[PDB]
Structure formats: structure tokens, C-alpha cells
Amino acid sequence: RMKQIEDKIEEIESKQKKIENEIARIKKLLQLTVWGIKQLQARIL
Amino acid sequence: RMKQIEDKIEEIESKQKKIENEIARIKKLLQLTVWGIKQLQARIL
Amino acid sequence: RMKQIEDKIEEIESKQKKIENEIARIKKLLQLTVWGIKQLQARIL
């Protein structure tokens, strides 16, 4: 029974790491879009 | 004590689903903005 | 084994709060990018 709980915790932790990885990728892409908007507006203005 | 562990695990799993859902929605909108920036670069510049 | 479980649960909860705070920040900046793309389109095209 202790292992069943421990396995659950492992699964959650693993899922949390994947989520953290996803959020980092999202932040990078979001920063790219910020840069692209900045670049577009710069070339015009 | 075991009750608290079981309850907290359920809360964590629910919050994780909430987070995954928020991430899904963020990703779709981010893909839209990437597309819009691409269109503006071409159509303006 | 119960203490170990409880410590990991606390760690997971702390991380979930951090993640929720990251998502809040991402959402705000993403809303600004949506507005900026809208603005460039409106002003020029």
C-alpha cells in the first residue's frame, strides 16, 4: 500500500516535470512573438 | 494522517488537470499569434 | 515511509503554486501580444 501511494507521487512528479518543460517552451515562444511584434513595429515606425 | 495524504493527492491531481487545461488553451492562442505575426510581416513589410 | 510521502506532497503543492503564478504571468503578456498584433493590423492595413 505504501508503494501504491509512492508510485502515485512519482507519476504526479513526472507529470509536473513535463508541465514545467512545457511552460519553459511556451515562455520561449511567447518571447519570440514579443520580439517579432517589436521588430515589425520598429521597421514601420 | 492517511486521510490527509489521500485527500491532498486528490487535490493535487485535480489542480494538475486544471493546469494542463490552462496550458492547452494558452498553446492554441499562442499558435494564433504566431500565425498573425507571420501574416503581418508578409502583408505589411 | 509516511513522512517521506508527506514531504514530497508539500514539495508538489509548492511547485503547483509556482506554476499557477507562471501561468498568470504568461496570460497577461499573451493578452498584450494579441492587442499589439490587432494594433499593427488596424493602424496599417
Q: Choose, out of A8, A34, A41, the residue to mutate when testing the contact with B (most B CBs < 10 Å).
A: A8
3-state secondary structure of C1: coil
Neighbours of B26 (CB within 10 A): 18
Identify the burial level of C36 via C-beta atoms within 10 angstroms of its C-beta, where 0-12 means exposed, 13-18 middle and 19 or more buried: buried
Closest CA to A35 of C36, B2, B17, C25: C36
d(Cα B35, Cα B32) in Å, to the nearest integer?
5
State the cell numbers at A36.
Answer: 517579432
Q: Tell me if C33 sits within 8 A of A30, measured CB to CB.
A: yes
**CA dist list (Å): C12 to A4, A20, B15, C16, C24:** 17, 12, 11, 6, 18
Quote the cell numbers at residue C41. 493590423
C-alpha cell at B1: 494522517
Contact predicate B43/A42, CB 8 Å: no
Provide the grid cell at C26: 504568461
Q: Which domains does chain A have, with CATH numbers?
A: 1-45 (1.20.5.170)
In whole angstroms, give the CA distance from residue B23 to residue B31. Answer: 12
Give the B window 5-44 contacts with C, CB below 8 Å. Answer: 5, 8-9, 12, 15-16, 19, 22-23, 26, 29-30, 33, 36-37, 40, 43-44
Distance from CA of B43 to the nearest CA of A (A): 11
Q: Which residues of B touch C37 (CB under 8 A)?
A: 33, 36-37, 40
- Kindly report each contact of residues A19-26 with a partner whose C-beta sits within 8 Å and lies 24 or more positions away, as own/partner: A19/B16, A19/B19, A19/B20, A19/B23, A19/C19, A20/C15, A20/C19, A22/B23, A23/B23, A23/C19, A23/C22, A23/C23, A23/C26, A26/B23, A26/B26, A26/B27, A26/B30, A26/C26
* Contact check, Cβ <8 Å, B1/C5: no
Q: Could you tell me which residues come within 8 angstroms of residue B29 by beta carbon, excluding any fewer than 6 positions away?
A: C30, C34
